[PDB]
Design an enzyme around this catalytic site. Structure first.
Site, PDB file in Angstrom:
ATOM      1  N   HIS A  67       1.097  -0.626   0.123  1.00 26.92           N
ATOM      2  CA  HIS A  67      -0.271  -0.386   0.304  1.00 26.92           C
ATOM      3  C   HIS A  67       0.404   1.348  -0.109  1.00 26.92           C
ATOM      4  CE1 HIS A  67       0.604  -0.690   4.438  1.00 26.92           C
ATOM      5  NE2 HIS A  67       0.857   0.735   4.652  1.00 26.92           N
ATOM      6  N   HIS A 146       5.582   6.599  -1.147  1.00 30.11           N
ATOM      7  CA  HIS A 146       6.511   5.362  -1.453  1.00 30.11           C
ATOM      8  C   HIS A 146       5.436   4.190  -0.816  1.00 30.11           C
ATOM      9  CE1 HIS A 146       6.575   5.977   3.014  1.00 30.11           C
ATOM     10  NE2 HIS A 146       6.188   4.504   2.758  1.00 30.11           N
TER      11      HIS A 146
END
Length: 215
Positions: A67, A146
């Site tokens: 995620h 990220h």
């Protein structure tokens, strides 16, 4: 009884998108550890005739699905967590599907991850500045975006975003340097102090759904 928020909001990659990025990340570590450019600078990587295995080095990994975190809320205890949750765009986007763009993979002595380049629509779900950190100074918003792939044994989760930002701070200054090697996915860069970045020739596309995690 008020309603408390999730542990954090973010885009959660599907099973296939997770597996795809998860494999490419593993491959990258195997390629880097084998690369001669990296073997010369193992001194900068770890203080302690033989070879290091980075897949083993980054033991602490995500168990299943990956995620991209947007806002760490800690059930509202975190600052600005509540103001973020009331945003119509957050409410409107909750549960909808998005396509995130991965531009590069990176490795540090602390974390292994992937750089996310969010679109404008996705940047609207990105939290803004109430306290603006020292690490992301001068960088556009969403630079921190990220996907954590790996962490060293004594590294905290917050470190991945900071490692990405730190690497991006060097690129801005022009200290990126020339590519020290060529991996099948893209050019390999050595930024010093054990920092390594793979600039993907082809932006990897992943499929995810924007939602909230509760622990």
């Amino acid at each position: 009884e008020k309603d408390f928020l999730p542990l954090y909001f973010g885009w959660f990659l599907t099973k296939k998108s997770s597996e795809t990025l998860r494999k490419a990340g593993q491959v990258f570590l195997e390629e880097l550890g084998n690369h001669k450019a990296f073997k010369k600078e193992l001194r900068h990587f770890i203080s302690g005739k033989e070879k290091l295995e980075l897949v083993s080095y980054f033991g602490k990994r995500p168990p299943g699905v990956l995620h991209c975190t947007t806002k760490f809320c800690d059930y509202g205890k975190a600052a600005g967590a509540e103001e973020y949750a009331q945003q119509e765009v957050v409410k409107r986007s909750y549960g909808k599907a998005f396509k995130l763009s991965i531009s590069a993979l990176f490795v540090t002595p602390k974390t292994a991850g992937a750089q996310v380049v969010l679109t404008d629509q996705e940047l609207q779900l990105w939290p803004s500045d109430l306290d603006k950190p020292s690490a992301s100074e001068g960088l556009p918003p969403g630079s921190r975006a990220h996907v954590a792939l790996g962490c060293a044994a004594d590294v905290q989760p917050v470190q991945t975003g900071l490692d990405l930002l730190d690497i991006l701070q060097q690129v801005k200054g022009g200290s990126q340097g020339e590519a020290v090697g060529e991996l099948p996915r893209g050019k390999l860069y050595s930024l010093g102090k054990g920092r390594w970045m793979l600039s993907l020739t082809k932006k990897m596309e992943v499929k995810a759904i924007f939602t909230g995690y509760y622990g």
